[PDB]
Design a protein around this nucleic acid. Structure first.
Ligand SMILES: [K+]
Ligand SMILES: [K+]
Ligand SMILES: [K+]
Ligand SMILES: [K+]
Ligand SMILES: [Mg+2]
Ligand SMILES: [Mg+2]
Ligand SMILES: [Mg+2]
Ligand SMILES: [Mg+2]
Ligand SMILES: [Mg+2]
Ligand SMILES: [Mg+2]
Ligand SMILES: [Mg+2]
Ligand SMILES: [Mg+2]
Ligand SMILES: [Mg+2]
Ligand SMILES: [Mg+2]
Ligand SMILES: [Mg+2]
Ligand SMILES: [Mg+2]
Ligand SMILES: [Mg+2]
Ligand SMILES: [Mg+2]
Ligand SMILES: [Mg+2]
Ligand SMILES: [Mg+2]
Lengths: 86, 137, 191, 208, 117
RNA sequence: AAACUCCAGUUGACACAAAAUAGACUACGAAAGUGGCUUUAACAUAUCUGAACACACAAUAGCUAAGACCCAAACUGGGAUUAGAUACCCCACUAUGCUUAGCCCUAAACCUCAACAGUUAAAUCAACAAAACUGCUCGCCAGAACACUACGAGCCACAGCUUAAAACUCAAA
């Protein structure tokens, strides 16, 4: 309200391509966490419920990053069988 | 020169122009995309209203207002009244994550207006008023 | 509900009876012509009457549409219309306990004070042999607690193949209420 | 089916066979050497290599057939085509030299154009979203549009509103009406389009 | 870098209160989840709403809306084939990083060992 | 549907309310708790355990008195749903959530895992959960239900809290 306007969350359109500008803006707001934040703020999330959600989201990140690390580590072994027939 | 997605900063000397007008002089299309309605107001850079349209003013009622095609129709209506007043290029400022957030912008383009920038102004309180309690469904 | 709002650019019917903002009758015309008129005059289209076979619409300004809506809400706030009578249903058993019949009797009383219609159905209790004369006694028990408050809108009548009875209760009319008070006063003077 | 999956359907087209070898591509050459090793189903007793064969009229005839009575269904079709041609020869001789140029006298051209004028471009299919089925404007495939045009024409002619009029006179009259973008079959198309337009707000319920 | 797990769970020897309360043991399974089909959405609506717009303006007369009508039919034809193209690529895994079936055979060869042998 | 229509949108001015992101950090505090900025004061114990006979604290809700009031919101009213709907769904609004000054002293106050010291070898170990143990100390427990109850006693508590039984009943829990 007290800040300058047309600086925050503003993307310029290139060659009249408004779809790519909107997708870029939506990608910006998602990566910064604003979209999920706006949605979670529609109804009041009680603190006990917020702590449970954050715990669940943090344990999922650890599991998902650890499973991804194992997939990338083992992906080289997806090559053809060197000892076929034995 | 390479394309910059960052808007030109007022007071600095930019070379970008739209019909001989600077970014600071382009009218603004304010799109309020609510969950049950979409309101579009086109204003001049000096805050002069030029056109207003919403899904309710376009003959949509109740749950039909909260749809994409309803917002698209509201955009076309506002674009038509704005084009008559001399508007071609507009800066879009959209607040809200309703279904007419993107569809309202399509209607502005189909109505003959050129969108040069998109700004999100969805209100996010930094800590603010307590929202209503969750729903049991 | 039917709201007094701009119909929009899309008109349901092809042939439209139109009027002017000043009330001047513009006659019947195609919806396409009406759209041209709305743009030419920069006015919005409202629906004044729908019952008429030729759909009647009127051109109006945004301010005029508001003034009409302001008038209508004052007409209702000042002279509110009664709402449609809501029908409440109860299905009882012949062997219903006396505590549960008092609970449902108190519930029927609250429905009658709100001027609702109470449809009361009584079915034959489970593993019970009962006669229609005994089931019909429950209705009188329910209506005896409401001496001058309720009466039979529809009297007990066998239904569902004669298995169950069914009556409809209502609140006494103002004329019927003054009659009850009159008759009650006469008995007081006699006694 | 009494044909094993190995049996391929027959291709009845004289031109496909007389086509010279040089014009053939390497893909079309492979298909031809392949079919020499494949089993071919017997040709159905409907379609032949005749130059007067029309798959659309043959299909319309089957949709009019009651209880396998093809002889009667075929008789009604050929009686309808003659009734269309005679109605146009009468309109042709009674018209002026200028109007005569615009009058079509071929019943096959009228039959095809009459059906194409009744094909519904958009359809309405029930769609389940949030545990509730909703009628929703949806595109129609080309096969479905042709079928609906035929079924609507046959249904209209079978309506009891027509009293003692024989089918070749009813169908001939309806085809010429639709040929000119008139009649009750065109109205049925406009109704489906109007119902699709009034349910435009419900388009999002579709998931394909 | 994976977030730390030191001192995060309620355990003997860990003085602080637990940071995380996992309802499942934080131990890698020998399988990944199955490819979750993306929610479907209506397509070609833009062309569908241009055709129905002309009908509204031309009394639902197809003669005046031939160009828009053909455009709607082309969009559906292109989208109809897109159903076949995506499905073929979805099974082939042309766009997927790997298929859950292919990714699970690879994990079967290197099973997580949460026990001592 | 009801509700509002001195309503809605843009712009400007404008809190005694709440404290995006950082935080994928894992810190502070005895626990309860504590995540906007600044400053002041300030975070016991140079053995350990130890007060249910004391002392000082103790989320939320609640009580008394004087204030503030955006938003949320028991209750209540209205709309809807239903066989009914004292609910779930929608709207309005109050106590209350905030401040100040006193009370009340309860939580699944649970990380249901006491403090201090030490070990990873032997028998590793009912099961599950968060591997198994040793020394030492205090607290607590002894079939279920009756019973977060009765009585007594204490308490700013008067429909309260703390401590807390028995009879009858069962062959299980
Ligand atoms: K903050
Ligand atoms: K956070
Ligand atoms: K306790
Ligand atoms: K716990
Ligand atoms: Mg009912
Ligand atoms: Mg668990
Ligand atoms: Mg000590
Ligand atoms: Mg307290
Ligand atoms: Mg308080
Ligand atoms: Mg409020
Ligand atoms: Mg208050
Ligand atoms: Mg505060
Ligand atoms: Mg706690
Ligand atoms: Mg405990
Ligand atoms: Mg201790
Ligand atoms: Mg220790
Ligand atoms: Mg015991
Ligand atoms: Mg208690
Ligand atoms: Mg007690
Ligand atoms: Mg006592």
């Amino acid at each position: 309200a007290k800040h300058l306007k047309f600086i925050a969350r503003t993307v310029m359109v290139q060659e009249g391509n408004v779809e790519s500008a909107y997708r870029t803006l939506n990608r910006i707001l998602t990566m910064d966490g604003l979209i999920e934040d706006i949605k979670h703020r529609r109804y009041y999330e009680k603190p006990c419920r917020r702590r449970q959600r954050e715990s669940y989201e943090r344990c999922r990140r650890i599991y998902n990053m650890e499973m991804a690390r194992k997939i990338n580590f083992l992906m080289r072994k997806n090559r053809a069988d060197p000892w076929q027939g034995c | 020169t390479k394309f910059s997605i960052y808007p030109p900063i007022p007071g600095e000397e930019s070379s970008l122009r739209w019909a001989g007008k600077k970014f600071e002089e382009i009218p603004i299309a304010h799109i309020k995309a609510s969950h049950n309605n979409t309101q579009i107001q086109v204003v001049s850079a000096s805050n002069e209203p030029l056109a207003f349209a919403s899904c309710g003013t376009e003959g949509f009622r109740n749950a039909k207002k909260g749809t994409g095609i309803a917002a698209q129709t509201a955009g076309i209506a506002a674009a038509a009244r704005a084009k008559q007043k001399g508007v071609i290029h507009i800066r879009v400022v959209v607040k809200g994550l309703g279904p007419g957030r993107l569809s309202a912008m399509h209607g502005l383009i189909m109505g003959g207006l050129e969108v040069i920038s998109i700004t999100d102004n969805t209100p996010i309180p930094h800590x603010g008023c307590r929202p209503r309690k969750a729903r049991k469904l | 509900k039917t709201a007094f709002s701009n119909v929009g650019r899309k008109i349901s019917q092809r042939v439209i009876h139109l009027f002017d903002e000043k009330g001047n009758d513009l006659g019947n015309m195609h919806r396409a012509n009406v759209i041209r008129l709305m743009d030419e005059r920069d006015l919005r289209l409202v629906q004044r009457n729908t019952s008429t076979e030729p759909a009647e619409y009127q051109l109006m300004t945004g301010l005029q549409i508001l003034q009409e809506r302001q008038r209508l809400r004052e007409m209702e706030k000042a002279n509110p219309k009664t709402g449609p009578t809501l029908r409440k249903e109860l299905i009882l058993s012949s062997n219903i306990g006396q505590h549960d019949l008092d609970t449902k009797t108190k519930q029927i009383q609250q429905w009658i004070k709100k001027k609702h219609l109470v449809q009361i159905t009584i079915k034959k209790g489970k593993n019970v042999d009962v006669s229609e004369n005994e089931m019909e006694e429950i209705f009188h028990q329910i209506l005896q607690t409401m001496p001058g408050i309720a009466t039979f809108s529809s009297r007990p009548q066998a239904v569902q193949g004669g298995k169950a009875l069914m009556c409809v209760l209502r609140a006494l009319s103002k004329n019927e209420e003054k009659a009850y008070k009159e008759t009650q006063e006469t008995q007081e003077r006699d006694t | 089916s009494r044909y094993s999956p190995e049996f391929k359907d027959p291709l009845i087209d004289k031109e496909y066979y007389r086509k010279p070898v040089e014009e053939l591509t390497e893909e079309e050459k492979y298909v031809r050497e392949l079919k020499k090793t494949q089993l071919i189903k017997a040709a159905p007793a409907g379609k032949t290599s005749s130059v007067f064969e029309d798959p659309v009229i043959s299909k319309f005839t089957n949709m009019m057939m009651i209880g396998g009575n093809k002889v009667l269904a075929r008789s009604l079709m050929i009686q309808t085509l003659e009734a269309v041609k005679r109605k146009q020869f009468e309109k042709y001789h009674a018209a002026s030299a200028e109007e005569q140029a615009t009058i079509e006298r071929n019943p096959y051209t009228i039959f095809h154009q009459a059906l194409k004028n009744c094909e519904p471009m958009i359809g309405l299919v029930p769609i389940l979203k949030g545990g509730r089925f909703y009628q929703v404007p949806v595109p129609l495939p080309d096969r479905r549009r042709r079928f609906l045009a035929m079924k609507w024409m046959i249904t209209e002619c079978r309506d009891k509103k027509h009293q003692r009029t024989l089918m070749p006179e009813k169908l001939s009259h309806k085809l010429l009406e639709a040929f000119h973008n008139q009649g009750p079959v065109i109205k049925r198309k406009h109704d489906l389009h109007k119902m699709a337009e009034a349910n435009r707000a419900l388009a999002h319920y579709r998931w394909w | 870098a994976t977030p730390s797990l030191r001192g995060r769970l309620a355990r003997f020897g860990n003085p602080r209160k637990p940071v995380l309360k996992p309802n499942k043991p934080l131990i890698l399974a020998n399988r990944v989840g199955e490819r979750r089909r993306e929610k479907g959405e209506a397509t070609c609506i833009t062309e569908m709403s241009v055709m129905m717009a002309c009908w509204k303006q031309n009394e639902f007369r197809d003669d005046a809306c031939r160009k828009e009508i053909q455009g709607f039919l082309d969009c559906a034809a292109r989208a109809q084939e897109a159903r076949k193209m995506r499905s073929i690529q979805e099974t082939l895994g042309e766009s997927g990083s790997l298929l859950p079936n292919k990714l699970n055979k690879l994990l079967q060869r290197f099973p997580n060992k949460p026990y001592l042998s």
